[PDB]
Design a protein around this nucleic acid. Structure first.
Ligand SMILES: *C[C@@H]1C(=O)C2CCN1CC2
Ligand SMILES: *C[C@@H]1C(=O)C2CCN1CC2
Ligand SMILES: *C[C@@H]1C(=O)C2CCN1CC2
Ligand SMILES: *C[C@@H]1C(=O)C2CCN1CC2
Ligand SMILES: *C[C@H]1C(=O)C2CCN1CC2
Ligand SMILES: *C[C@H]1C(=O)C2CCN1CC2
Ligand SMILES: [Zn+2]
Ligand SMILES: [Zn+2]
Lengths: 194, 194
DNA sequence: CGGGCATGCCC
DNA sequence: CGGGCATGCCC
């Protein structure tokens, strides 16, 4: 009955976890202490999928944004009117895109109105321990009429072809002009005032 | 042949001049030194019309915004996509509105695509030396996808019913959250660095 | 590139 | 209300 998707971590029977590459001026950088990705708008944000056990054929990987703060959780995260107007398969209203994938699907939920982007799950290549997806966030966190400075979480779910939830993980995202500066600022704030 | 309207002051045979009331946190304030109005979005910005001689019946008062800097003069000044979407008679794309007037006309030029807003000229009441029009600016100067931090001029023209230009005056506008702060900052910059 | 201005807003 | 943070950007 809820229109707010769960953000509860569920690593599940397949041992599903997210991973991030190690990285002022940088195009993205991930803070383990904050569980937070800092990245630039319309630029590659790699996310690694790690599993202990192999998902069944036909498993799908869904990404969805939700506002982090309780006061905004019920509002659908959308692209701002400016970036919606300056717009391949991604509807211009969608914040999150996937690049480099020929089987991407963009979904608008008939009941909750929430946007999500889905690609097939593929196991890592021989010798690799993870699968990397290239996400793109098409607005800054600050965009007026869109996220409007409100932090979001990205929720990544592993789902089988039948719709069973196999795993769920989430990370906070700040899309900003200066990821390196802002990560250092927030980590210092955590140490000094958190 | 030009699509850029003239901004040249032409006080003309009727002795046409603009006037402004004397005024942090203030909703508007005019700087004589800068010939610049500082005002808040969607709030009253009174402009006084002064003439030495009485215009003929059917005279009209037109207001139009142009970008002040040479690099942007040829671009039409428009409302940003966010404020256009969150919108009486004024088309949502128009930056400048007039409130309190039952004969307001909003014009989109067929050839130059520029927006303007027009009201009839009315002489001052007995004992008064000027006529006041209440303008509203529907975006901040900073609005992304609109003025985008670029200064504008407002051009006020007195035109007879036949289309003759009787007078022209202009003033710079900064639409901003804190007119009093920003006026003091710019006037200090003028004294120290201008 | 990094230093520092910008400017709506602080929940 | 004013002090000062915010955060894309400096032409
Ligand atoms: C955004 C990511 C990173 O974390 C670094 C810098 C750019 N990409 C790949 C490596
Ligand atoms: C998660 C794995 C690794 O450890 C490296 C970088 C990303 N994938 C493939 C090789
Ligand atoms: C915006 C104008 C002014 O200059 C002062 C303050 C509010 N209005 C009327 C007087
Ligand atoms: C321009 C005139 C004045 O001097 C005062 C204020 C505005 N109008 C009417 C009275
Ligand atoms: C973040 C900051 C930088 O380091 C360069 C890119 C964006 N911004 C301006 C220059
Ligand atoms: C300009 C500044 C003020 O003085 C109040 C109104 C807008 N802004 C925040 C509070
Ligand atoms: Zn945006
Ligand atoms: Zn606007």
């Amino acid at each position: 009955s809820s229109s707010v998707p769960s953000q509860k971590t569920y690593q599940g029977s397949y041992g599903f976890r997210l991973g991030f590459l190690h990285s002022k001026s940088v195009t993205c950088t991930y803070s383990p202490a904050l569980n937070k990705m800092f990245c630039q708008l319309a630029k590659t944000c790699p996310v690694q999928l790690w599993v202990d056990s192999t998902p069944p054929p036909g498993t799908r990987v869904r990404a969805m944004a939700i506002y982090k703060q309780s006061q905004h959780m019920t509002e659908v995260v959308r692209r701002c009117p400016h970036h919606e107007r300056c717009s391949g398969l991604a509807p211009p209203q969608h914040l999150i895109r996937v690049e480099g994938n020929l089987r991407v699907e963009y979904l608008d939920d008939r009941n909750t109105f929430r946007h999500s982007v889905v690609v097939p799950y593929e196991p890592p290549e021989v010798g690799s321990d993870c699968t990397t997806i290239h996400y793109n966030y098409m607005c800054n966190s600050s965009c007026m009429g869109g996220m409007n400075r409100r932090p979001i979480l990205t929720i990544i779910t592993l789902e089988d072809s039948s719709g069973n939830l196999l795993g769920r993980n989430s990370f906070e995202v700040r899309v900003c002009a200066c990821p390196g500066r802002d990560r250092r600022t927030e980590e210092e704030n955590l140490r000094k005032k958190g």
